[PDB]
Amino acid sequence: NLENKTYVIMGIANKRSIAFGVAKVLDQLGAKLVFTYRKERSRKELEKLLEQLNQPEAHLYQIDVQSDEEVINGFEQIGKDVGNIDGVYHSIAFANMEDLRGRFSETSREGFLLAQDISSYSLTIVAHEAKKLMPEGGSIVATTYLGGEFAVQNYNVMGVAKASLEANVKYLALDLGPDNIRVNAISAGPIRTLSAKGVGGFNTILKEIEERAPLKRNVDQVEVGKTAAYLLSDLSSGVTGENIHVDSGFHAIK
Amino acid sequence: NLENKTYVIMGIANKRSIAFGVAKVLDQLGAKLVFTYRKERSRKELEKLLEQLNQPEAHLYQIDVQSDEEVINGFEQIGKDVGNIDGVYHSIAFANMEDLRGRFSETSREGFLLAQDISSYSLTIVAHEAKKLMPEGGSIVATTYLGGEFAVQNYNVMGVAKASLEANVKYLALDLGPDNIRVNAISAGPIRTLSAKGVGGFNTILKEIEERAPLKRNVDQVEVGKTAAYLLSDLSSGVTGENIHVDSGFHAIK
Amino acid sequence: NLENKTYVIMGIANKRSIAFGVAKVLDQLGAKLVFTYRKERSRKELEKLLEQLNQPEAHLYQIDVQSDEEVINGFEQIGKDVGNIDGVYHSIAFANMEDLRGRFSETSREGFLLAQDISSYSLTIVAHEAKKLMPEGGSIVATTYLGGEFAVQNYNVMGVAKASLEANVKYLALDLGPDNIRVNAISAGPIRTLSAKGVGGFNTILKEIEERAPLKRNVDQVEVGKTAAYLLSDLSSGVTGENIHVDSGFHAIK
Amino acid sequence: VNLENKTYVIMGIANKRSIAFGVAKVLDQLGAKLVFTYRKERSRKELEKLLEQLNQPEAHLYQIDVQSDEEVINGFEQIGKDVGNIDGVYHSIAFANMEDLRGRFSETSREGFLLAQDISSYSLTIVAHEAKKLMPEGGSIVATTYLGGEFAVQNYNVMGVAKASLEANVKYLALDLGPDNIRVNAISAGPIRTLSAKGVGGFNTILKEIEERAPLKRNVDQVEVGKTAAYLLSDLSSGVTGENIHVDSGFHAIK
Ligand SMILES: NC(=O)c1ccc[n+]([C@@H]2O[C@H](COP(=O)([O-])OP(=O)(O)OC[C@H]3O[C@@H](n4cnc5c(N)ncnc54)[C@H](OP(=O)(O)O)[C@@H]3O)[C@@H](O)[C@H]2O)c1
Ligand SMILES: NC(=O)c1ccc[n+]([C@@H]2O[C@H](COP(=O)([O-])OP(=O)(O)OC[C@H]3O[C@@H](n4cnc5c(N)ncnc54)[C@H](OP(=O)(O)O)[C@@H]3O)[C@@H](O)[C@H]2O)c1
Ligand SMILES: NC(=O)c1ccc[n+]([C@@H]2O[C@H](COP(=O)([O-])OP(=O)(O)OC[C@H]3O[C@@H](n4cnc5c(N)ncnc54)[C@H](OP(=O)(O)O)[C@@H]3O)[C@@H](O)[C@H]2O)c1
Ligand SMILES: NC(=O)c1ccc[n+]([C@@H]2O[C@H](COP(=O)([O-])OP(=O)(O)OC[C@H]3O[C@@H](n4cnc5c(N)ncnc54)[C@H](OP(=O)(O)O)[C@@H]3O)[C@@H](O)[C@H]2O)c1
Ligand SMILES: CCCCCCc1ccc(Oc2ccc([N+](=O)[O-])cc2)c(O)c1
Ligand SMILES: CCCCCCc1ccc(Oc2ccc([N+](=O)[O-])cc2)c(O)c1
Ligand SMILES: CCCCCCc1ccc(Oc2ccc([N+](=O)[O-])cc2)c(O)c1
Ligand SMILES: CCCCCCc1ccc(Oc2ccc([N+](=O)[O-])cc2)c(O)c1
Ligand SMILES: N[C@@H](CCC(=O)O)C(=O)O
Ligand SMILES: N[C@@H](CCC(=O)O)C(=O)O
Ligand SMILES: N[C@@H](CCC(=O)O)C(=O)O
């Protein structure tokens, strides 16, 4: 029961977004939710999607995590509009198509730094800013993929960005631990989302989970959200710097 | 919420046992519990601690995991008395102090195989027998320690037993995943229990956790129980073959 | 260059044995080699395979690693016959087919402990006995497989023995380090040997390596010997508790 | 491991204490022809001096700042024209502002974080792309990392995230260049007293700890990194790619 808890959810694009998974779960559990989006199309979208939840009001803030100004000012406003928060769910990443579709060794500096910037550094600046609204502690969760731990064909620059995010989680966990802010990752399995269309080989990878993961099935947004509810609540007190694979056990087999 | 769920908890000895941590949490959550024990003295303790729980009746079985017949017959008896179950919490290990207190290179054969038998093989046979009571699926959690992942001074033959256990979780997760039985481990940080008393250097490790781990404090049995509630419930439905560290982040640092 | 170095090599059964690839590389680099075997038939294969070696003397010793007396007496006689040694190559494992070709959850107790005993404990006792012949330090290498790190379908009870063995290596490395004795693992890719004939689905794994491993080909016994050469020698002086994958990179992908 | 007729580019020597100069002494001793890249003229001057300790009949020295595509591209092309086809690269390059390093990790600047990624990780990707052109037949790329890439090590801060990137960069390059028979691997070196080591808060207290706690109860040195580099760069390690060999007295294996 997360009543009288407040969470910030970053990265809803549409009904299929992983973070809308996390949203439905936290909403059921009685949390108050604040949302951040990048472009005005995701906002309109968000307003329509919000009619599906028991949120008594719409708390929506624009934050492109490439802008410090936007992250700093975004969290300040949230603080003034909503008070201290209990946690942040980070569901944000980006890479060029031009770089995803080339050979990994053909990645451009610009593309490689862009993916680092949006997919890994954004968590550091978000963690620094969100800390200001968690004076009594809290919990921050980011969404990673198995390709940050292994080379997964086609995942290329994003995998190096996830490897980076996954260490970001460990260093934020160590840094923010004494302030009672826990930082953790969920490694989701493959899920059909807007961003997933930009990864070459996605369907083939869907099929191989079905055939090979211990549970012989794929996962969904809602199973990610249920694990997110654990990481964001007191149920996981004691757990920090952790990466929980929500992926039908595929991480455990070779 | 675990009303209408039944779990088996193996390996309460007294009030400081990790498994009694788990018991309190599950009981608070509405679960029906069944308890298994090896020594008479542990049943006496169980009978006393039950008075602190909401369990309307004692379901206690003697199962010494060195004996197939006891595991088979115990689980069969459980099925007759409470019907189908939804999972098992395994909190059992053992090694001769004469091995634990030696140089690892001096471990006796009989002592090494004794630690494997009780600390690891026991999970396999518990799972095979418990599966018959989970025709619809369920969840099995075993308790491990960091020493199965890295060589920790003084943990000696038990580290090799926990490495074995941790792989046993993985092979079971794979084997039983198609049956919808999830198998996971909790890697508990150090906690004062009766068994901790046989580990050379224990108190030293307690203090190195407070100083060095991200959260700057040790964990307790109830915090293991909250992560057990998570692994044992539908909250963790896409998670199998996993090892969740309940250790103040100590696992993520070096 | 290994002139005036003496290594013991355990586990040659025939010309296809991984340990015979080790033998060829070390024999070629100038090393003196001492060979241990179990079956009378491995001694005969050894007597015949010594002909294509530069070994001017056959030093063959019956050691079944199930017997403490055998390992203890055999190393004492080795020390008496060839003096102090520089290193041990461990290439020994065993499990019942009956346990191998079953679901892992059906593994017998006696099958589980047989595999732990020969495939892991053998290393702990060999290390202890061979430390006596390494007053100035040396190097000890064992052979593992990726299935000790992840649940590889059909590998079953041997995966759990290999996870055990890999912990054994780390715990020996920590214990024996102050004596300047280094202890490491080679994780070999799949290789057609006599023992590979007991693992189900070995041919389909061969195929999958070629299709998927970074190098798109399988490896061989010599390639293991070449890494054994490195680890047994001073080239690897700051390296212990390590697991080197000789597997075309397959460990590094998913 | 005899390396005549072999040629290795060695990036990142700044003085006699550099890890890369460990690598040099070893390969030079095993008969390798060696080519050396550097950023600051100061390091080139240092290279000219250290070359007198080596067996190298001629000095092959190239200025490559890995922040510039041009200098990496023209560097390697220029290399290929001077000495021909190469057998491998030892990448011994990293950087991050002290400014980001001696502060809280959560206080890391974007510019600083991206700088660390640029010099310490991305540089591997472009070096490999350009060095491939001189390896039509196969070879070996080795990069240098630190345990703080795998675990949050106190004070390593932004460099730890950069090393995680590097270690993944090794894995993705291995997969990609595997079928061209180029192996890509990392050495995870123990702490060593170098110029760069002076950037890291708490460096001396870690040296002490290794010596008290690491299996071998002593620290490692640059020649030890070199002997492993010689293994990774040679045919001794056919079969081995996408791997990270910890040359650190066993410290990685303990907790
Ligand atoms: N789907 C999968 O199979 C899978 C698996 C494992 C991990 N993940 C991870 O899960 C997370 C969510 O992705 P998804 O698959 O759920 O796809 P998604 O719905 O398309 O979400 C990606 C989100 O990132 C936001 N975003 C991108 N750049 C941003 C920026 N600079 N500033 C602010 N927001 C930005 C996008 O917002 P706008 O639309 O407003 O631009 C979008 O909401 C990502 O971290 C992804 O790497 C996904
Ligand atoms: N305390 C810690 O810091 C720590 C950390 C990580 C993991 N763990 C793990 O947690 C689990 C429980 O340990 P604990 O610390 O809670 O200590 P504990 O209270 O002493 O419990 C150990 C239990 O194991 C049972 N057991 C031993 N051999 C058995 C056998 N042959 N058959 C059936 N049961 C047997 C004991 O039963 P009887 O007394 O009836 O014989 C006892 O109830 C163990 O796996 C341990 O490795 C402990
Ligand atoms: N082939 C592969 O794909 C593969 C992959 C990864 C790791 N490995 C490992 O490589 C090592 C060698 O196996 P292999 O593949 O080379 O097959 P192998 O040629 O059949 O060698 C197996 C050896 O184990 C010895 N052995 C078994 N039980 C013993 C005992 N109780 N006492 C003493 N020696 C005993 C056998 O000796 P006898 O014949 O005299 O009984 C035989 O020499 C093993 O550890 C195996 O797990 C193999
Ligand atoms: N010492 C250790 O304890 C340790 C441990 C683990 C890993 N490492 C790694 O080992 C590698 C070598 O460092 P080291 O300890 O030997 O220190 P070092 O002697 O200071 O060498 C660092 C080298 O990096 C070069 N460099 C930095 N930025 C560059 C750029 N933009 N373009 C081209 N070259 C650049 C420097 O060249 P200039 O001086 O000419 O600019 C210098 O030669 C680094 O990757 C470091 O992260 C070191
Ligand atoms: C080789 C196939 C691997 C399957 C991929 C699993 C997965 C799917 C979508 C993922 O989310 C992404 C992917 C790309 C971008 N983008 O390019 O901007 C943003 C977010 C993901 O991380 C992870
Ligand atoms: C030197 C390591 C210090 C931390 C160890 C933490 C720990 C404490 C108790 C633990 O539980 C044990 C230990 C020993 C035995 N026994 O000898 O029978 C049974 C169960 C444990 O796994 C792990
Ligand atoms: C399903 C995985 C297929 C690849 C297996 C690679 C491999 C091959 C042989 C292997 O070596 C042995 C040695 C003995 C026994 N046995 O006695 O049953 C079994 C295996 C191995 O460990 C590992
Ligand atoms: C608390 C950690 C102590 C151990 C660190 C060992 C180590 C030493 C030097 C290291 O090399 C570096 C470090 C920093 C910079 N820089 O600030 O530009 C450049 C290269 C290193 O990676 C790694
Ligand atoms: N070395 C002491 C440490 C005390 C403790 O266990 O914490 C012992 O063996 O008892
Ligand atoms: N299926 C046979 C042969 C191996 C294969 O075809 O994969 C076995 O399990 O022994
Ligand atoms: N913290 C020291 C580094 C080495 C130490 O004294 O532990 C410094 O200010 O650079």
Which string of DSSP letters, residue by residue, matches B133-172? Answer: T-TT-EEEEEEE-GGGTSB-TTTHHHHHHHHHHHHHHHHH
Residues in a beta bridge with A9? A35, A89
- Round to the nearest angstrom and report the end-to-end CA distance of chain A: 37
**Do residues D170 and D181 touch, judged by C-beta distance below 8 A?**
no
Extract the tokens encoding A89. Answer: 């769910």
Among the options C7, C37, C89, C145, which is catalytic?
C145
Q: At residue A17, what are phi and psi to the nearest 5 degrees?
A: -60, 145
Q: Would you say how long chain B is, in residues?
A: 254
Coil, helix or strand for A251?
Answer: helix
Cα–Cα distance measured from residue D185 to residue A205, given in angstroms and rounded to the nearest whole number? 26
CATH number listed for the domain at residues B1-254: 3.40.50.720
As given in the structure block, the two tokens for residue B175 are: 């084997």
Q: Which CA distances in Å does B12 have to B54, B206, C144, C239? A: 17, 22, 36, 42
Using a 10 angstrom Cβ sphere, with 0-12 exposed, 13-18 middle and 19 or more buried, the burial of residue B206 is: middle
Rounded CA-CA distance C188/C191 in Å is: 8
B151 touches chain D (CB under 8 A): yes
Distance of CA D59 to the CA centre of its chain: 20
Q: Chain A within 8 Å of B247 (Cβ-Cβ)?
A: yes
**Residue partners of C92: CB distance under 8 A and separation at least 6:** C10, C11, C65, C118, C119, C122, C143
Given 3-state DSSP classes, what are the helix, strand and coil percentages for chain C, each rounded to the nearest 5? 50, 15, 35
Q: CA angle D128-D133-D138, nearest 5°?
A: 80
Number of C-beta neighbours around residue B106 at 10 A: 16
Task: Look at D241 and C214 and tell me if their CB atoms are within 8 Å.
Answer: yes
Residue B250 Cβ contacting ligand 6 at under 6 Å: no
Kindly determine whether residue D153 and residue B214, on different chains, have CB atoms separated by under 8 Å.
no
**How many Å lie between the alpha carbon of D66 and the closest alpha carbon of chain C?**
26
Contacts of C57 (CB under 8 A, 6+ apart): none
How far apart are the CA of B198 and the centre of ligand 6, in A? 7
Beta-carbon neighbour count of residue A40 at 10 Å? 10
Q: Is D146 a catalytic residue?
A: yes
Q: Does D117 touch chain A (CB under 8 A)?
A: yes
Q: Collapsing DSSP states into helix, strand and coil, what is residue C142?
A: strand
Ramachandran sector of residue B249 (left: φ over 0; alpha: ψ -120 to 50; beta: rest): left
How many angstroms is it from C199 CA to the middle of ligand 7? 6
Which residues fall within 8 angstroms of residue D117, CB to CB, at 6 or more apart? Answer: A112, A113, A116, A164, D161, D162, D165
Q: How far apart are CA A72 and CA A64, in angstroms?
A: 11
Contact call for residues A178 and A235 (beta carbons, < 8 A): no
Ligand 4: residue whose CA is nearest its atom 43: D12
> Would you say A141 and A130 are in contact if contact means Cβ atoms under 8 Å apart?
no
Contact C163 B162 (CB under 8 A): no
User: How far away is chain C from the Cα of B60, in angstroms, using its nearest Cα?
Assistant: 25
Residue D154 DSSP one-character state: T
Contact C149, C101 (CB under 8 A): no
For the record, the structure tokens of C180 come out as 């300047």
Q: Which of the ligands is closest to the CA of residue B40?
A: 2
Mutation probe of ligand 11 site: the residue of D195, D200, D207 with most atoms within 8 A of C-beta: D200
Which residue, A153, A154, A168, A81, is CA-closest to A117? A168
Contact B156, B112 (CB under 8 A): no
For chain C, the chains sharing at least 3 beta-carbon pairs closer than 8 angstroms are A, B, D
d(CA C246, nearest CA chain D) in Å:
5
**Widest CA span in chain B:** 50
Cα separation of D36 and D11, whole Å? 6
From the number of C-beta atoms within 10 Å of its C-beta (0-12, 13-18, 19+), residue D30 rates as middle
Residue (of B174, B55, B157, B165) closest to B99 by Cα position: B157
Whether A151 and chain C come into contact, CB under 8 Å, resolves to yes
Question: In angstroms, what is the C-alpha Rg of chain B?
Answer: 17
Stated in angstroms to one decimal place, the resolution of this structure is: 2.3
Q: How many CB atoms lie within 10 A of CB C200?
A: 14
Strand pairing class (A138-144; A181-188)? parallel
What's the per-residue H, E or C state across C42-92?
HHHHHHHHHHHCCCCCCCEEECCCCCHHHHHHHHHHHHHHHCCCCEEEECC
Q: What share of chain A is helix, strand, coil (3-state, %, to 5)?
A: 50, 15, 35
D210 CB-side CA count, 13 A: 22
CATH match for D1-255 among 3.40.50.920, 3.20.20.140, 3.30.230.10, 3.40.50.720: 3.40.50.720
CA angle A58-A63-A69, nearest 5°? Answer: 130
In this structure, are residues D186 and D145 in contact, taking their beta carbons and an 8 Å threshold? yes
Using a 6 Å cutoff on CB, does residue D204 contact ligand 11?
yes
Provide the chain C residues 204-223 that lie in CB contact (below 8 A) with chain D.
213-216, 219, 223
Determine the Cα–Cα distance for residues D65 and D54; give it in Å rounded to an integer.
24
Which chains would you list as touching A if contact means 3+ CB atom pairs under 8 Å?
Answer: B, C, D
Closest to B145 (Cα-Cα) out of B136, B158, B156, B128: B158
Q: How far apart are CA C23 and CA C35, in angstroms?
A: 9
Indicate the helix (H) or strand (E) that contains A20.
helix A18-28
- By the CB < 8 Å criterion, does C146 face chain A? yes
Which residues make Cβ contacts (< 8 Å) with residue A247, sequence separation at least 6? A146, A187, A188, A189, A209, A213, A219, B238, B239
Q: Which atom of ligand 3 is nearest to the CA of C64?
A: 32
Residue C20 alpha carbon to ligand 3 centre in Å? 11
- Of B78, B93, B84, the C-alpha closest to B38 is B93
Helices then strands, counting H and E runs in chain C, come out as 9, 7
Provide the 3-class DSSP secondary structure of residue C144.
Answer: strand
Could B241 and C151 be called an inter-chain contact, meaning their C-beta atoms sit closer than 8 Å?
yes
User: Which residue has 């894995």 as its token pair?
Assistant: D171
Residue A10 backbone dihedrals phi, psi, to 5 degrees:
-105, 125
Return phi, psi of residue D188, to 5°: -95, 95
**Separation CA A40–CA A62 (nearest Å):** 8
Q: SS3 for B239?
A: coil
Instruction: Name the nearest CA neighbour of A195 among A21, A64, A17.
Output: A17
Closest CA to ligand 3's atom 32: C64
Query: Which member of A113, A121, A127 has the closest CB to residue D118?
Result: A113
CA of B201 to the centre of ligand 9 (A): 4
Region of D234 please: left (phi>0), alpha (psi -120 to 50) or beta: beta
- DSSP structural state of residue D150: T
DSSP letters spanning B182-237: EEEEEEE-----TGGGGSTTHHHHHHHHHHHSTTSS---HHHHHHHHHHHHSGGGT
C181 contacts C134 by C-beta, under 8 angstroms: yes
Contacts 24+ apart (CB under 8 A), C130-133: C130/C8, C130/C75, C130/C85, C130/C88, C131/B105, C131/C176, C131/C179, C131/C181, C132/C75, C132/C76, C132/C79, C133/C75, C133/C78, C133/C79, C133/C83, C133/C84, C133/C85
Q: Which residue of A has its CA nearest to C254?
A: A152
Three-class HEC string of D69-113: HHHHHHHHHHHHHHHCCCCEEEECCCCCCHHHHCCCHHHCCHHHH
Say whether B121 is catalytic.
Answer: no
Chain C interface, mutation test: which of B164, B165, B180, B240, most C Cβ atoms within 10 Å? B164
**Inter-chain contact A105–D128, Cβ cutoff 8 Å?**
yes
Answer whether A151 sits within 8 Å of D171, measured CB to CB.
yes
Own/partner contacts of B15-20, CB < 8 Å, gap of 24 or more, are: B15/B45, B15/B49, B16/B191, B16/B192, B16/B193, B16/B194, B16/B221, B17/B91, B17/B193, B17/B194, B17/B221, B18/B91, B18/B143, B18/B188, B18/B191, B18/B193, B18/B221, B18/B224, B19/B89, B19/B91, B19/B143, B20/B49, B20/B221
Cβ proximity of C123 and C90 under 8 Å? yes
Task: Return d(Cα D255, Cα D229) in angstroms, integer.
Answer: 26
Using the structure block, give the residue that is written with the tokens 């403490």: C68
Q: b or e along C154-188 (b: 16 or more beta carbons within 10 Å of the residue's beta carbon)? A: bbbbbbbbbbbbbbbbbbbbbbbbebbbbbbbbbb
* Collapsed DSSP state (helix, strand, coil) of residue A32: strand
Say yes or no: B254 contacts chain D, CB-CB below 8 A. yes
Q: How was this structure determined?
A: X-ray
SS3 call for B34:
strand
Q: Does D254 sit within 8 Å of B153, measured CB to CB?
A: yes
| CB–CB contact C252 D231 (8 Å) | no
The closest alpha carbon to D174, from C191, A103, C222, A144, belongs to: A103
Atom of ligand 10 nearest to the CA of C203: 7
d(CA B206, CA B217): 9
Closest alpha carbon to A247 in A225, A226, A219, A228? A219
Q: Compute the distance between CA of residue B223 and CA of residue A21 in angstroms, rounded to an integer.
A: 26
Chain C contact set for A147 (CB, 8 A): 254
Angle subtended by helix axes B122-131 and B156-176, to nearest 10 = 30
Are A27 and A54 within 8 A, CB to CB? yes
Q: What is the CA radius of gyration of chain D?
A: 17
d(CA A162, CA D110): 17
3-class secondary structure, B35: strand
Dist. CA D103–CA A128, nearest whole Å: 13
- A187 alpha carbon, distance to own chain's centre: 9
CA of C154 to the centre of ligand 7 (A): 10
